[PDB]
Design a protein around this ligand. Structure first.
Ligand SMILES: Nc1ncnc2c1ncn2[C@@H]1O[C@H](COP(=O)(O)OP(=O)(O)O)[C@@H](O)[C@H]1O
Ligand SMILES: Oc1ccc(Nc2nc(-c3ccc(Cl)cc3)cs2)cc1
Ligand SMILES: Oc1ccc(Nc2nc(-c3ccc(Cl)cc3)cs2)cc1
Ligand SMILES: Oc1ccc(Nc2nc(-c3ccc(Cl)cc3)cs2)cc1
Ligand SMILES: Oc1ccc(Nc2nc(-c3ccc(Cl)cc3)cs2)cc1
Ligand SMILES: Oc1ccc(Nc2nc(-c3ccc(Cl)cc3)cs2)cc1
Ligand SMILES: Oc1ccc(Nc2nc(-c3ccc(Cl)cc3)cs2)cc1
Ligand SMILES: [Cl-]
Ligand SMILES: [Cl-]
Ligand SMILES: [Mg+2]
Ligand SMILES: [Mg+2]
Lengths: 342, 349, 344, 349, 346
């Protein structure tokens, strides 16, 4: 569970999204540490969409000891799905992966920084720490969510599946990739000041009760009897999350790192006041949002779920990336890829 | 940091063992706990236990809906009975989610000690510890905790909230029950006297470390039947001569035994410690004493081994070995266990 | 590197090879030890040549922690070729093996007993020791010899390939199977009295000059040998012997330099011109591993990774791990650490 | 036990360093060796070899066909030169088969001490050792021996017949040269003095264990370039702080240092020892002292590791390390090696 | 499913218990079976079977494709292990169709004895018996056989090829082991002892007579519901013995069911009710040798053909003999499945 020393690493870096500085930051904050650690690297700049995915899908992986993704959660989403689309996905997905933050959504990197014992740092301190994790070369396994859509598309998630309030802010937030991390804050405040609700059917398989998704039945079927069908059909948000953090300053799952093959499921049922949600959002920065007595926020650890938006298409965010659908279910696979971490 | 709250106000069932704080749990409840509850607008009802499995049988038949939490005032022993009672129920999946609370009266209060530690408190003992744990109850914050599922050679399946010990620790526990009046110092006594009457224990230990896991009640998917060898991806310990084996889910082995000073266990993880035969008494004593301040690791005894595990199997090797399970004696030929992540909720802060 | 405890093992036992006592020996000398070590076994009895091979070719290998072969070297020859003939040969040949001596030729079990530190014991003493080795469950890799014949047969050797004197004694010997180890002794004295030489050409590739696995050192038999190979000038021989282990039988410590390195085998040959009396000296000295301490210009030793051998007069008779094979030419390459045996 | 024999009668080239044995090598030849050769019908010719690489250049250019054996009278150092001289030859593959013989003079006679041991003699020293090695040559028996192939960061490739040492052992071989007049006891004095400032050495050690191998001169197939990491099936040692690392091909480190009592190396195998930082001075000394009787393994000191290997890599952190190769000083950034099975032949019994 | 013959030539796996025919099974095989096989071109491989359940694990993990049939050379208890092993495989549906064959070695060869009877042979024993069944295998003809599906209160689901016995029969099978070394004869000595100690057992017996995952037992209702209303609930609550028997013989010399071979899906149910005299019970036992026991019309001995039954021992628990293998429970029930597997027969 350690990278060779010396080793070599492919760094797939997005020179633009977030700030336009990803490459200069690499140079000032990442590179000097790589050199002392004897990690030589090659930079490949990712031009546009699916570029990274297609690169990884066609890559001779045997030349690399790890792949490092320097951008946001989206890039890592691209990389892991590209490895999963290959004929040789079974061995390909075992290539070690690393996440260095530059984008606006650095949840995976913020999570790993958390697991390593660091304070909840941000930006350049976050980059440096994640870089230090890479330089110590230690790897641990990570869970993978297998998704399935209304139209028979399989995709994989490494961080989260979101619906309702969260997906909306993520969508409308893009018109300020400019504000950085803060774009989600402005984007929440204003959706929150003008709060609304969404209609669907949530079901899941709690912990108590491509790879085969043994727990899932065709989306056409009713769920199995042993699943839990949520009574409500009116939510402010549904969220499946595989890690501790939603962003570098959103400690959304204060019980910490998930167990193998388990995901965090949250939902806010309809009825909350805007002042409560704000209070909750705000509390989430320090991960204090569960310390509040609010029958509207429900938490469950699960291995599977299904969400059907009532009346046409709901907007979903998968690892922060927008997605239109009418029905998705998914199952968590344990310990399915290696990441660098402490 | 907290992952849930009790309602305010709330109602609480209190299971108390009157032969505890040796003999005066009730008076401690009355002096140290009740007035704090009253100000926190926590209603309670006191139920008195005493007899074996009583608390277990009660929790098994309880209508859990009337209570916001179960507060167990006694030792680790009583928490063990309650959790096993909830797990034995037909509706165990929902019953294990009733929040639980540990208020130290009994002899061994490692659970309460750990939670006081997690909360940022000094390492306190007796009534300072009781007051701290009650303060936690008053603040109402909940965290999920891991649970160890155990299986014995005789086919018993049982749960453990704190610890499985074998060898020196298990003997000293069983012995020591005479000096129980002497309160928590009963273990320092036992440990001192047995460290001079050292005996070793032969058996086989295997385990599954965290890093090496691939892709009635819950199923323990990591475990194979005891008559089968362990899976090849496990570590099978070479040494078959032991002073002790300890599986521990928490930071503390007693109100003054900071046994696991590396960090708090992740979800689905516990600490495994064993001490292989041939250590010198004086090194074993320095380990003990340094344990009080959690400095025993700083010594690298390469006779003492620690590993974060998700499951283990332990076979003594010369008849029905003597184990302590969350402090309670149990004898059997072989035992194995797997941790289940965040299975029940406790008051903590 | 170690079998599971408890474990389960298939014993392929040939019930009448050697003196024909294998099964009672297993019952007397082996079974009590396996019970104490917590090794369940199932016995399968072999009925004829190739039986063992066929059982192993079609066997469900996932039910077994090892295969124990209780016979001579020939049964192990059959078991290993059985695994190599399977489509899943690459994982199959990684099943651990163990050899318990109970035929007349027990070179492999004698070599393993030697590597484990014991004395050069015979019969039930040998059987006991090799059982003590299984009970302790330790495993180490062995080399494998890959062979190609003129007819285009591909076969594997775990122990030896022999031509000339040795191959002839093995075949003629067969009627003294009942005499255990003395089979080769009587067999040797007899052949000595009618000492013949044999015509052929020998080439090899020494250690310095360096569907199944690929034999990268080998080229088609029809083509001449690589220029970097050694082509022995001599062309009349008394014997040629490729040997992967230290013992040629339980009392023939043929390779006193001991256990081969990975990927290496012992090649010996005796050139034409030796007298009967000297060949007899070498042979008796070989009991104690002393035969190389004699000044004998006819006995040549080289460690090699490959060899080719062509009997120029028609079909030469070979013994492969003691099994008779007839052929116009053979070549082979040894592969390192190709399978697991129980040893110490 | 012998794997070949010298002819009787035979003739031998004797390469002798007149400076060794405190300058008495030639007179020791005359008193202890010559009279035995005569009775054994061994002819000889003596060639004096004292300047640097002299003996190496001799063996490189010699017509080896005129000799049955080369006998080397001096230390491990001269054996080292001769063997490297043979391997530097364009006909090295036949040259390296010339039987070699090691006759002890002076100190640093670990090779002669091992052969004397393999043959069954007591651990004798000085003239007794010389006599014994001489009686081995008269008996004419030959055995093949392992050879270590080394590569340094600077790109040099060399061969080692005995050992590669780094850290404390190398520092003492080096600091020790001044008391060369005292003989073998200089390593005691050197060890004793250097123990006072026991320093540790920072580096990275990786090796290939015997059981883990799967499927210019000779090719070193187990080795990859010094700038690539070692193959993933090697063991990288976690500790990066050592007092010593020793690769050793034979039983003796010196004529009174039975360092490898666990048994003679099989073909293609060597011993690897290292001492992790944090042993006390006293225990290091006790391990040293116990080495006289090959008893140092009996302490099971947790700081001393032994492993049979076929290849290793050792990379001093902090620029150049000081190494000893067959006792001779060599300085380098990084060194790796692998053992070649039974490459040359030596007289032994 | 399919036709009732073996291929010629064929190859066969032989599971032999060596500790049988008092330690002679293998020698019996060598002198009595092997030369017959060789002439019929039946290839075989022998595999020996030590411990309890060993045959069962072996058959459960076996690559069935290598074999045209599995021969069991032991007693009824080995056949029992073999079938249960086949029925425990994920692929139980195809596995249960591999033909089986039963060669007698030593005691407890009811099944073998039945087959030899159905074949038209005289009631022979030991080596004569072994030779006949071997001739059967050489002739290569097969018949379908009934299989009994058993469920226990503890949720245990097992299968019987021959019998479920309780009371007097089960005790004699148990108490018999302490001198198995005596052979078939030991059943006679156990019988003689239990008889002087004649006792009854408390129980409730119910059946469905002929007139009115795993395989589905649709005649059976869960052991907690009462039996369906059309079943016959026997009034007696005290028995000397109860015996579900799928074949004509209880042993080589015990022709226990002479009223005719069972049709597909039928089994024999016998019971002896409380009150029979010792001398009478013993008369039944002795006359059963030549199948003459029913000719007594002794009112204590009851016979019915059935398709399903329920037995509830109510003196706490009961020990059963299931194909002669011992087992203990508070409640069992079963349903015969018709023509469920293949066996060499004539
Ligand atoms: N039951 C059997 N009857 C006759 N020959 C057999 C039997 N089982 C195996 N054989 C064959 O007999 C040959 C001799 O076996 P081997 O193990 O080499 O013993 P030995 O050491 O006496 O040569 C092997 O080729 C083997 O396949
Ligand atoms: O990517 C986004 C992240 C957070 C938000 N904002 C909000 N999150 C929440 C919220 C509260 C609790 C949990 Cl567990 C998760 C999210 C309420 S408002 C919007 C988009
Ligand atoms: O309940 C008990 C606790 C400790 C003891 N005695 C001892 N424990 C230890 C010990 C040392 C190290 C660890 Cl990690 C844990 C316990 C040494 S002596 C006996 C009973
Ligand atoms: O299986 C056999 C083994 C040896 C022999 N006989 C002989 N072997 C030899 C011999 C001599 C030297 C060596 Cl290195 C090996 C064998 C001489 S006579 C016959 C059959
Ligand atoms: O040439 C030298 C040999 C030994 C020493 N000194 C020492 N060696 C050791 C030592 C201990 C154990 C082993 Cl296996 C080998 C050497 C301890 S101190 C110095 C120079
Ligand atoms: O008071 C003194 C103490 C040590 C010394 N000198 C030396 N000590 C050592 C030495 C060697 C081994 C040990 Cl364990 C301790 C000291 C070598 S030189 C001199 C004066
Ligand atoms: O395996 C055994 C077979 C028969 C017996 N003993 C007896 N069986 C009977 C008997 C009577 C009538 C029938 Cl239909 C069947 C058995 C009477 S005494 C004991 C053990
Ligand atoms: Cl690179
Ligand atoms: Cl088995
Ligand atoms: Mg994104
Ligand atoms: Mg043979």
């Amino acid at each position: 569970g350690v990278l060779p020393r010396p080793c070599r690493v492919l760094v797939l870096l997005n020179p633009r999204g977030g700030k336009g500085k990803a490459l200069q930051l690499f140079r000032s904050h990442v590179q000097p540490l790589l050199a002392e650690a004897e990690i030589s690297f090659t930079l490949m700049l990712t031009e546009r969409r699916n570029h990274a995915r297609e690169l990884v899908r066609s890559e001779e992986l045997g030349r690399w000891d790890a792949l490092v993704v320097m951008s946001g959660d989206g890039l890592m989403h691209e990389v892991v799905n590209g490895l999963m689309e290959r004929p040789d996905w079974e061995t390909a997905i075992q290539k070690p992966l690393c996440s260095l933050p530059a984008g606006s959504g650095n949840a995976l990197a913020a999570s790993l920084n958390h697991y390593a014992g660091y304070e909840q740092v941000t930006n350049e301190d976050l980059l440096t720490n994640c870089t230090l994790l890479l330089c110590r070369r230690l790897l641990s396994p990570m869970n993978l969510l297998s998704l399935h859509t209304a139209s028979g598309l399989r995709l994989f998630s490494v961080l989260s599946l979101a619906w309702g309030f969260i997906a909306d802010v993520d969508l409308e937030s893009e018109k300020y990739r400019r504000l950085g991390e803060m774009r989600f804050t402005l984007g929440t405040f204003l959706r929150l000041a003008a709060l609304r609700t969404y209609r669907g059917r949530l079901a899941y398989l709690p912990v108590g009760r491509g790879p085969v998704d043994a727990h899932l039945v065709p989306l056409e079927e009713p769920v199995p009897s042993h699943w839990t069908v949520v009574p409500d059909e009116d939510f402010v948000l549904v969220l499946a999350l595989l890690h501790s953090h939603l962003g570098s300053e959103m400690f959304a799952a204060p019980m910490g790192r998930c167990a193998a093959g388990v995901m965090h499921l949250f939902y806010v049922r309809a009825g909350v006041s805007r002042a409560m949600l704000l209070r909750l959002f705000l509390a989430m920065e320090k991960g204090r949002h569960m310390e509040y007595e609010c029958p509207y926020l429900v938490y469950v650890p699960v291995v599977a779920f299904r969400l059907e938006p009532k009346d046409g298409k709901g907007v979903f965010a998968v690892d922060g990336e927008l997605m239109v659908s009418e029905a998705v279910q998914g199952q968590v696979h344990p310990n399915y890829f290696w990441m660098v971490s402490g």
